[PDB]
Amino acid sequence: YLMEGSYNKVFLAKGNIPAESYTFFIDILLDTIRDEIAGCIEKAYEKILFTEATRILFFNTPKKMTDYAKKRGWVLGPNNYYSFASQQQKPEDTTIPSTELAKQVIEYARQLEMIV
Amino acid sequence: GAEEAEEVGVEHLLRDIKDTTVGTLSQRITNQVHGLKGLNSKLLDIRSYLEKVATGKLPINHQIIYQLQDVFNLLPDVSLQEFVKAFYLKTNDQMVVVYLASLIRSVVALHNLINNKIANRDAEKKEG
């Protein structure tokens, strides 16, 4: 149900999860909630607002989500949220795909030689 | 220039050389001679455009230096010269060579592979 898509099955499970000191591990389970939020808060998203940080994150506002606005290089918009102004950091990667393929022509054309 | 037949002597007196079917190293001979023998001539051109800056009088810039600094200004540019037309133009180029090598060398896969196997296993198990 974690990999089904319910982060609230966590809090339904933690109703009875002591389980002979299964408290530290459910705290690290809260950790593997929150750092995956630190992955999945704007993965391919447009933006979120504060109430999405009230839903997906919890504990309304600590200085831990204010830390989340000040740890990862975050744009704390005015009641607004951005990964960046572009979220993807201008992908073109070479703007030249051709010359390295001519290096493929170097070793590959060498491979065409020595054989027959 | 070479005019007429005259090789009853000459190409009998070769006694060493082979007509290469170009694509058999003759191209890299030309690579050594134009790369090396062209760019040491470029070093003669830095002998020109350094020695003339140093000690060169009146033909330092008579009438052809800037005039063929134009022809030098075909493509001398700074960082990587940014031939942005030439890269998808180069997709139009390497387009051809990789499509011919791909389909045609798969035909060469028929060439080598098929009768290589046939004459192979004829020679192999027909030996018994």
Add this chain to the structure above:
Amino acid sequence: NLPKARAALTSARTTANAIYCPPKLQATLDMQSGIIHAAEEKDWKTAYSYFYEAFEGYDSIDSPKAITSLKYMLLCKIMLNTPEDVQALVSGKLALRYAGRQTEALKCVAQASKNRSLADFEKALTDYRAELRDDPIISTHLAKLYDNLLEQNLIRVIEPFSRVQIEHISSLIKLSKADVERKLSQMILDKKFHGILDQGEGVLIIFDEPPVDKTYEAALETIQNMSKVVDSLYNKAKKLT
């Protein structure tokens, strides 16, 4: 009625081949030989030769029966590819010989639909309501001319320049979506017209490059090579066992 006039064809080629002097009904059979055989499309003009000896077998015939004995052949000259009916026949003395009237509408429609500015078929469709007559009896003699003149107009408006949005090119027909889209998509299907229409922006764009024998010739030859390798796999399985 091509089945019924096919029965009249079979009774005609041997029943009326035995009547000795039927000169009047012989030219009537020649009109059948123009009508049914251009309707089988035996030839475009030898059927008109059957109309044309049929024509000279239409003397000493009753004058209302005479004037309907010429409509199929003047109307064949309408059905003579190039609308050349005006310059030869109806400005010629024949329509100025008898009491024909509908043929004198064939003057103006055969001339204004020579002018290639339309203005004619829509205008004189009411004038040809008597000449449309049996809606399902002719159905061809104006439909091939005008339903040629559709794509004739299309190669007047769409031929000179390829890309255009759909409504301004159809401002010369003033419907934008009724049949000109289906006519042009039909011309995509009929390869007179190599382009792509649009509705969301409604922007028609024409472009083409079919032939790559680098892909076609080599690829299909290698498929044939696969077939011949499969032809060799039994020399293989044969030399195995």
Add this chain to the structure above:
Amino acid sequence: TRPANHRQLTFEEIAKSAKITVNEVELLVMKALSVGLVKGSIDEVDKRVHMTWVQPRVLDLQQIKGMKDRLEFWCTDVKSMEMLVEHQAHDILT
């Protein structure tokens, strides 16, 4: 003066520094078409004055010295990468 790209120049430095207006830059090149030292393929969907081959200068002796970053650049880079090809195409010497 800038050797590098962005040779499809906007008219901005043309309309600014060459004391011309936007409607005359075409004349500024069409008359230059009658000149024939530069033969640019000037954009007219973006009004961009494109730079093709030119008659560049008369003398820059500081770049007759300072041409080394193009000339020796060409020498040891086409020669060095020449030896990178021939160093890759090494043991096919055969």
